[PDB]
């Protein structure tokens with residue numbers, strides 16, 4: 001894909017748009033009582049056997065990017081999202097491609113309280129798309145284990161849809177979770 | 192990994208033992224009202240960023256391979272499992288390996304009702320290991336989409352722990368969900 005501004009992407013004609021969101025909350029939990037979780041980051045296994053972020057297509061002639069995302073988040077993540085307001089303030093980036101098809105992808109990042117993310121996971125099973133478009137929700141491991149591979153580097157060898165891996169890596173840098181050198185180390189160990 | 196009898200494996204001192212289980216249930220659901228789900232098969236995202244089946248290390252001097260499995264299932268999947276039977280009749284295969292620790296793995300396949308699986312997924316959030324060892328449950332796509340890659344072939348390109356991928360393909364044949372040529376077709380399509 002190619003980087004584009006929101007305003008520029010919204011002036012385009014004959015492009016399909018999609019919105020996807022990273023929902024996250026801080027955690028005081030420690031794996032094996034020693035390895036800090038740091039933060040809960042939500043992704044999903046999709047119907048197509050690839051990992052991704054919740055969200056989907058939006059017809060911007062009908063509804064705003066935010067309204068489209070909202071509807072798609074309720075379908076995929078479930079009832080608990082009616083208490084969540086992902087707004088324009090949560091918008092981060094847009095990327096554009098022309099092949100195979102003209103598509104713009106918008107990426108949102110929204111911090112929640114831990115209890116809020118926990119409620120989302122608990123009610124995700126009740127989503128309209130559970131066991132269909134959505135095959136399950138997963139947390140992203142942020143740590144690297146002692147073997148220097150387990151955790152995030154191994155996670156990054158899974159199968160990701162579209163530019164979702166790049167969006168994840170963007171969030172990690174954006175949220176100041178990992179330094180640039182740390183991101184490169186994680187990608188080296190992964191490959 | 193190498194195939195080994197259950198009877199032979201327990202008499203092999205110095206080896207560590209682990210037990211893992213495929214819990215599954217039939218389904219009448221259709222993806223996009225078109226592609227039959229056929230069956231719900233449970234796997235998980237692990238703390239280590241790999242996909243696997245629920246279960247884990249079982250001390251053989253402690254109790255039976257069944258008992259060690261049942262406690263891990265409750266630990267990983269939650270309190271719903273206390274009610275789930277589990278028996279030697281659910282045992283399927285054992286694999287032994289030397290490289291990277293001496294390890295015997297036992298594979299279990301148990302068919303449940305769809306409601307039971309649904310209840311399991313719904314209370315998984317309550318499991319001692321949710322958000323720790325277990326990063327979330329997932330269902331396995333059994334179908335292949337029109338592009339001939341999406342669904343099962345794409346799913347098999349994920350990162351699988353140990354021989355869990357081998358184990359899954361065994362189950363797909365074992366439960367007669369795919370023939371051998373069909374399995375060979377998804378593996379090539381996957382690796383392409």
Ligand SMILES: [Mn+2]
Nearest residue numbers: 054055056076
């Ligand atoms: Mn979607």
Ligand SMILES: [Mn+2]
Nearest residue numbers: 055056072133
């Ligand atoms: Mn959707």
Ligand SMILES: [Mn+2]
Nearest residue numbers: 055056057072
């Ligand atoms: Mn949609």
Ligand SMILES: [Mn+2]
Nearest residue numbers: 245246247267
């Ligand atoms: Mn385990």
Ligand SMILES: [Mn+2]
Nearest residue numbers: 246247263324
């Ligand atoms: Mn365990």
Ligand SMILES: [Mn+2]
Nearest residue numbers: 247248320324
């Ligand atoms: Mn453990």
Ligand SMILES: [Mn+2]
Nearest residue numbers: 247248249263
């Ligand atoms: Mn254990």
